[PDB]
Amino acid sequence: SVVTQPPSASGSLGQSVTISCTGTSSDVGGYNYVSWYQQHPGKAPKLMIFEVSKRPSGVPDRFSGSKSGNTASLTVSGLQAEDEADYYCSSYAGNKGVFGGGTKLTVLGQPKAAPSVTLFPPSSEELQANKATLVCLISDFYPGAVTVAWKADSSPVKAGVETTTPSKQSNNKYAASSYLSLTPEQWKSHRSYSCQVTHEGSTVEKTVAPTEC
Amino acid sequence: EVQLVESGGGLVQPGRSLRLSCAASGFPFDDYAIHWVRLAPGKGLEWVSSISWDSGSIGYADSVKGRFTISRDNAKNSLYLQMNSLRAEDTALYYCAKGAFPGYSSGWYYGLEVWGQGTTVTVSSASTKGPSVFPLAPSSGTAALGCLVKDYFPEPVTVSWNSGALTSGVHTFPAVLQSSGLYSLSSVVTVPSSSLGTQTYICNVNHKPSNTKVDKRVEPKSC
Amino acid sequence: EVQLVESGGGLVKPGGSLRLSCAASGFTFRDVWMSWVRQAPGKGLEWVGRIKSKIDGGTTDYAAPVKGRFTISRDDSKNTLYLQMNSLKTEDTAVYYCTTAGSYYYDTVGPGLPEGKFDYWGQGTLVTVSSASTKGPSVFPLAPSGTAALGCLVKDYFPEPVTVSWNSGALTSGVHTFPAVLQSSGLYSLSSVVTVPSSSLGTQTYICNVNHKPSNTKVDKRVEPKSC
Amino acid sequence: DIVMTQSPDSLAVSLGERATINCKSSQSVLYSSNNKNYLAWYQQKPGQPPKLLMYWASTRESGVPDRFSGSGSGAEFTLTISSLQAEDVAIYYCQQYYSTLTFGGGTKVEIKRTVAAPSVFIFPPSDEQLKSGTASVVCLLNNFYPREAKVQWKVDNALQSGNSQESVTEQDSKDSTYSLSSTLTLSKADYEKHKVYACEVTHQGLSSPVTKSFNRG
Amino acid sequence: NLCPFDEVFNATRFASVYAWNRKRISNCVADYSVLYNFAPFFAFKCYGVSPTKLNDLCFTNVYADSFVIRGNEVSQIAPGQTGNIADYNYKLPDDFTGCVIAWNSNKLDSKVGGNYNYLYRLFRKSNLKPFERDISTEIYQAGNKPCNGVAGFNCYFPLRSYGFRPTYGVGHQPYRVVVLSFELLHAPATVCGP
């Protein structure tokens, strides 16, 4: 089967948190070969616990494994910002292993980070392919929530707007990007385009113009 | 170092077949038993198959039962996975992983120490599409410049700068889903302003899906 | 309780032979790897030998200096350890402890420790290897004249030492059984002084009990303030 | 076998200070088959057997305070007492059990203390003894510190030599004090040739030298 | 002339499971008095063979295998019961026509400082053949660098210790095990004890 594991968990900075993991008597309750794996975005999994509660070389004591029947539990004390990641348990089951559904851990109490907006106008090369794109790039912000609003001159545009959901960078912070598509005609028509980036009640409007080239 | 690197994946028409390869390096692979594990978008880790060193013990997963076929050439230090009758559900990232010590089931007992960085497998009926790359110039005490990888499918693309020599200040953004179901990415580097007359910057885009490489030269706009 | 009582040390002539005996009680004796460890005056501990449990073979191991001059024995029915010593030397003069040290790391005994521990040592008997003769000690008062002081002077005896117990050992006010000095003639003299208050001198009969079992001298000397 | 080594040989620190001992082995006592060090630490107060402090190089014996704590692995071990107490004065031995039993050289641990002037007492010869024809004059110096002291016998103001013998105690478990005994052995003949038998004590605790003395009358 | 079962079960020291001991029993009447052998064993189960007075039968040889493992892994000693112990520390045949017995030893094998006498073969290249044994104690050069006969980075020893402590619970308490293999060759049966 698939192993019951809550989708989401949470804990404040410095606190603890437990990630339960419920299987059957033929896996979690069958053998004490329960592992736990940490996976950060765009990287391979890491072995964090093996044999229920044993830690490999170079893994903090903060992390501690345990079990009770068909329910294994991973507890992470002295929670740090970097702990904010996904976690799955593993188990032997006779010539085969099985994983949990997984749990995404969010670490609260991380300090606010202001966003840094960098808007780029259309390149003439692009324009020379009867296309135009403005490139707004957010970064270094926390929490992840951000609103992006574009405006042609004073008048906002909601077409050709595409926007990331903020992802996490090596700065342990976030990074969104909005792309406004235009026709070359629209670009030269309006005297400017702007990118409002609203984050935690504070705002950043950057502005670009065809005059800027 | 002990190093598993997986290759052999991309776009493939639903119902077709495809064969992946895990290149071993820095350990007696010929003793160590190896496993395939896949990570489906949104979903988590899922066991695929397990092959003993001697290839005398092979378990497959219920999902891929009588569909996939694992193999290995101990001489060439290579693990293979022949995937036939592919479906959308297979569409995932495919990791190759070994146990720290050498046992078929040891990997399960004492965990899987070493994992490769994976090769991505897309089972879509959609078409491939190679990117259009465009320079995001600065205007000549640092300067931000980059370039724009635009309208491609599937993921991923890689961007390196100055033939991978320019490494610092670099931030390749995650890509949006183009409304047309493509992708649009933007690599941006921060460099000294003083260097815009001296240094010339080139971003090295690569979309192997398409078999399409691009080196775009980014230079200060004339006004 | 558990206890390890060594018996049979004393004076033995150079090249002579002597049988030490350790009477053990309190713990499962036959399961433990018993050892002898010796100590020369002022010098450190030195392992002598070991006998393993007879279920673990009953192998003997001896140190380099005593290699093939000593012979360890065992009697599990009587719970007693022996050390047979032959071709003794002046180097071998030392106090010999029997101990359970080095056992628990290998032995087959489990968690049910007698007093919650395993490493036990005896008081250990003194083996003096000299070609000299025995001599009984002389007992002389160190008389008293706030808090005064008084003692007993044990003087001239061989070998060392003498057991000095102040008032059946009850008195412990300032008992200072200083080690007996080696005399030019090989004899031994100490001054077991026990500082006690003035007032108290009126009462509190001060009778040090000196015992020297090599010569088998038992002396109870009462120390009285002098009239002058 | 294995040459257990210790350093330093002697050690003295104040009350509640950091007391630090070491051990060096000619081989490794780290057994790969279980990943345990086969090493122990032993406390021995004078006149008593050794007491086990530490085994497996780390694990304390029942009831030993957290004060004591053994660390290290392989062939360079160490036992540190966080804060040295009065009774902690003793010699300690690092005995490995990896190969039979071999003990270290030994490290003597002593307490430093505020200066302590000696209480002094002379005892004249005993009537009983004088019959036998010998004179033993004693001098006591109970409760003194530091250890270094000078005791001169002087008979009718005559600097004596060659006829004295001393015995220092061990540093009192509690008081952390020393005591000394100087015994002046003379023949009855000589003992009668003189009148005043004095003992002069030079110490740090005494401003100017103190003398106690007796008169045969 | 009964078989020496008392020597097997009430032995002072049992073997580490990796070098599991094997005591041949031949030329003796194996009267099974387990029903009243003065020991309340944790459990008992005869695989293939049955304990219901089957003593009447005459066997060629009986190989009694002994060792100690953790309660958790008591099950591992069974036909088809894969795991560490099964795969690296002794294994039975799928067609196991024999009994197996084991019991708690916390008051026999648990040592205050931890028990390190008992060792479990951690890793091994191949799974063990039924009733096979390995006492290999060589370092494995997992690393692309040699070990020079030492354990360290990517250089591993092939054994480990159960470190039994009474504080531990049932799961990690020492449990001794005795196995009953019933051999029947062309040689005349030497043990019946009907």
Q: Which residue of D has its CA nearest to E115?
A: D34
For chain B, list the strands marked E by DSSP: 3-7, 18-25, 34-39, 45-51, 58-60, 68-73, 78-83, 92-98, 114-115, 119-121, 132-136, 142-152, 158-161, 170-172, 176-177, 183-192, 201-207, 212-218
Q: Which chain A residues are closer than 8 Å to E82 by Cβ?
A: 94-95
CA-CA distance, D192 to C137, in Å (whole number)? 25
CA-CA distance, E122 to E156, in Å (whole number)? 10
CA atoms within 13 A on the CB side of D71: 9
Q: Which residue has the tokens 């050069």?
A: E141
A99 lies in the same domain as A135: no
Tell me the two tokens of residue D91.
Answer: 């010699």
In a domain, A124, yes or no: yes
D69 lies in the same domain as D158: no
Tell me the two tokens of residue A165.
Answer: 């959901």
Residue B58 sits at the vertex; the CA angle it makes with B57 and B59, to the nearest 5 degrees, is 125
A171 lies in the same domain as A150: yes
The answer to whether the CB atoms of E83 and A95 lie below 8 A apart is: no
Residue pair C70/C77 in contact by the 8 Å Cβ criterion: no
D19 lies in the same domain as D95: yes
A15 lies in the same domain as A104: yes
Amino acid type, D52:
L
Spatial neighbors of D210 by CB under 8 A, at least 6 apart, are D120, D200, D201
How many beta-carbon pairs under 8 angstroms link C with E?
Answer: 29
Residue pair A96/B50 in contact by the 8 Å Cβ criterion: yes
D160 lies in the same domain as D94: no
D124 lies in the same domain as D72: no
In a domain, A113, yes or no: no
Tell me the two tokens of residue C128.
Answer: 């003096």
The answer to whether the CB atoms of E161 and D33 lie below 8 A apart is: yes
Task: Report, in angstroms and rounded to the nearest whole number, the Rg of chain A calculated over CA atoms.
Answer: 24
Total number of domains constituting chain D: 2
Phi, psi dihedrals of residue A124, rounded to the nearest 5°: -55, -35
Q: Which residue of B has its CA nearest to A56?
A: B113
Q: Which chain B residues are closer than 8 Å to A99 by Cβ?
A: 37, 44-47
CA dihedral of residues B145, B150, B154, B156 (deg, nearest 10): 0
E–C contact: 3+ Cβ pairs < 8 A: yes
CATH number at residue A43: 2.60.40.10
The answer to whether the CB atoms of B176 and A164 lie below 8 A apart is: yes
| CB of A164 less than 8 A from some CB of B | yes
Spatial neighbors of B173 by CB under 8 A, at least 6 apart, are A137, A164, A175, A177, B185, B186, B187, B188
Q: Which residue has the tokens 């940490």?
A: A38
Total number of domains constituting chain A: 2
Domain hosting residue D184, numbered range = 119-215
For D72-189, list the strands marked E by DSSP: 76-81, 90-96, 107-111, 119-123, 134-142, 150-155, 164-166, 181-187
Which residues 78-117 on chain C approach chain D with CB closer than 8 angstroms? Answer: 97, 99, 101-102, 104-105, 115-117
Which residues 56-75 on chain C approach chain D with CB closer than 8 angstroms? Answer: 61, 63-64
CA-CA distance, E184 to C211, in Å (whole number)? 74
Most D CBs within 10 Å, among E136, E161, E165, to test the D interface: E161
Cis peptide before C137 (omega within 30 of 0): no
A122 lies in the same domain as A160: yes
Q: Which chain C residues are closer than 8 Å to D97 by Cβ?
A: 101-102, 105
CA distances for E159 relative to C67, C198, D34, angstroms:
35, 71, 7
CA distances for A13 relative to A74, A77, A78, A83, A110, angstroms:
17, 10, 8, 9, 6
Three-state SS string over C123-145 comes to CCEEEEECCCCCECCEEEEECCC
The strand pairing partners of D177, in sequence order, are: none
A92 lies in the same domain as A34: yes
The answer to whether the CB atoms of C105 and D38 lie below 8 A apart is: yes
Closest-CA distance of chain B to residue E154, Å: 9
The answer to whether the CB atoms of C108 and E12 lie below 8 A apart is: yes
CA-CA distance, A124 to A108, in Å (whole number)? 45
**CB-nearest partner of D56 from E113, E151, E157:** E113
Phi, psi dihedrals of residue E109, rounded to the nearest 5°: -125, -15
In a domain, A1, yes or no: no
The answer to whether the CB atoms of D142 and C143 lie below 8 A apart is: no
| CB of D213 less than 8 A from some CB of C | no
Spatial neighbors of C129 by CB under 8 A, at least 6 apart, are C11, C12, C13, C14, C16, C88, C89, C90, C92, C93
| CB of E113 less than 8 A from some CB of D | yes
CA-CA distance, B136 to B217, in Å (whole number)? 10
Q: Which chain E residues are closer than 8 Å to B110 by Cβ?
A: 122-123
Domains of chain C plus CATH, in order, are: 3-129 (2.60.40.10), 138-223 (2.60.40.10)
Task: Count the neighbouring beta carbons within 10 Å of the beta carbon of residue C36.
Answer: 29
Phi, psi dihedrals of residue A126, rounded to the nearest 5°: -55, -55
Q: Which chain E residues are closer than 8 Å to A33 by Cβ?
A: 83-84
CA-CA distance, B98 to B4, in Å (whole number)? 8
Element (H, E) at D7: strand D5-7
Closest-CA distance of chain E to residue A31, Å: 8
CA-CA distance, B103 to B44, in Å (whole number)? 25
Residue C168 CA from chain centroid, whole number = 19
**CB-nearest partner of B103 from E87, E142, E144:** E87
The answer to whether the CB atoms of C45 and D38 lie below 8 A apart is: no
The answer to whether the CB atoms of C110 and E111 lie below 8 A apart is: yes
The strand pairing partners of C142, in sequence order, are: C151
Task: Count the neighbouring beta carbons within 10 Å of the beta carbon of residue C8.
Answer: 15
Task: Count the neighbouring beta carbons within 10 Å of the beta carbon of residue C69.
Answer: 15
CA distances for B67 relative to B33, B39, B70, B86, D74, angstroms:
21, 18, 10, 8, 54
The answer to whether the CB atoms of E116 and D36 lie below 8 A apart is: yes
Which residues 42-101 on chain B approach chain A with CB closer than 8 angstroms? Answer: 43-47, 50, 57, 59, 61, 95, 97, 100
The answer to whether the CB atoms of E161 and D55 lie below 8 A apart is: no
Domain closes at, from A74, A108, A142: A108
b/e A171-203 (16+ beta carbons within 10 angstroms → b)? eebbbbbbbbbbebebbeebeebbbbbebeeee
Q: Is B151 left (phi over 0), alpha (psi -120 to 50) or beta?
A: left
Domain closes at, from A55, A81, A108: A108
A71 lies in the same domain as A137: no
**CB-nearest partner of B117 from A44, A50, A118:** A44
Element (H, E) at D192: helix D188-193
A–C contact: 3+ Cβ pairs < 8 A: no
Cα–Cα nearest to B47, from B62, B66, B31, B67: B62
Domain hosting residue A199, numbered range = 118-212
D98 lies in the same domain as D186: no
Chains interfacing with E (3 or more CB pairs < 8 Å):
A, B, C, D
| CB of E143 less than 8 A from some CB of B | yes
E–B contact: 3+ Cβ pairs < 8 A: yes
- B194 SS3 class: helix
Where chain D is broken, by preceding residue (C–N > 2.5 Å)? none
D98 lies in the same domain as D160: no
A89 lies in the same domain as A129: no
**CB-nearest partner of A33 from B59, B109, B186:** B109
The answer to whether the CB atoms of E126 and B1 lie below 8 A apart is: no
D40 lies in the same domain as D107: yes
**CB-nearest partner of B31 from E87, E125, E144:** E125
The answer to whether the CB atoms of A96 and B179 lie below 8 A apart is: no
| CB of E114 less than 8 A from some CB of D | yes
| CB of E35 less than 8 A from some CB of C | no
CA-CA distance, E98 to E95, in Å (whole number)? 9
The answer to whether the CB atoms of E111 and C53 lie below 8 A apart is: no
Spatial neighbors of B184 by CB under 8 A, at least 6 apart, are A133, A162, A179, B148, B149, B150, B151, B152, B175, B176, B178
The DSSP secondary structure of chain C, one letter per residue, reads: --EEEEE--SEE-TT--EEEEEEEESS-GGGS-EEEEEE-TTS-EEEEEEE--GGGT--EEE-STTTTTEEEEEETTTTEEEEEE-S--GGG-EEEEEE-TTTTTTS---S--TTS----B---EEEEE-SS--BPPEEEEE----EEEEEEEEES-BSS--EEEETTTT--SSEEEPPPEEPTTS-EEEEEEEEEETGGGGSS-EEEEEEETTTTEEEEEEE-----
Q: Which chain D residues are closer than 8 Å to E159 by Cβ?
A: 32-34
Closest-CA distance of chain D to residue C18, Å: 22
Q: Where do the structural domains in chain E lie, given as residue ranges?
A: 1-113+166-194, 114-165
Q: Which chain A residues are closer than 8 Å to E84 by Cβ?
A: 33
Element (H, E) at A64: strand A63-68
Amino acid type, C61:
D
Q: Which residue of D has its CA nearest to E162?
A: D34
Most C CBs within 10 Å, among E111, E164, E168, E173, to test the C interface: E111
In a domain, A95, yes or no: yes
In a domain, A125, yes or no: yes
Task: Report, in angstroms and rounded to the nearest whole number, the Rg of chain C calculated over CA atoms.
Answer: 21
Residue pair A48/A63 in contact by the 8 Å Cβ criterion: yes
Task: Count the neighbouring beta carbons within 10 Å of the beta carbon of residue C83.
Answer: 24
The answer to whether the CB atoms of E112 and C113 lie below 8 A apart is: yes
Tell me the two tokens of residue E188.
Answer: 């005349």
Closest-CA distance of chain E to residue C103, Å: 12
Resolution in units of Å? 3.3
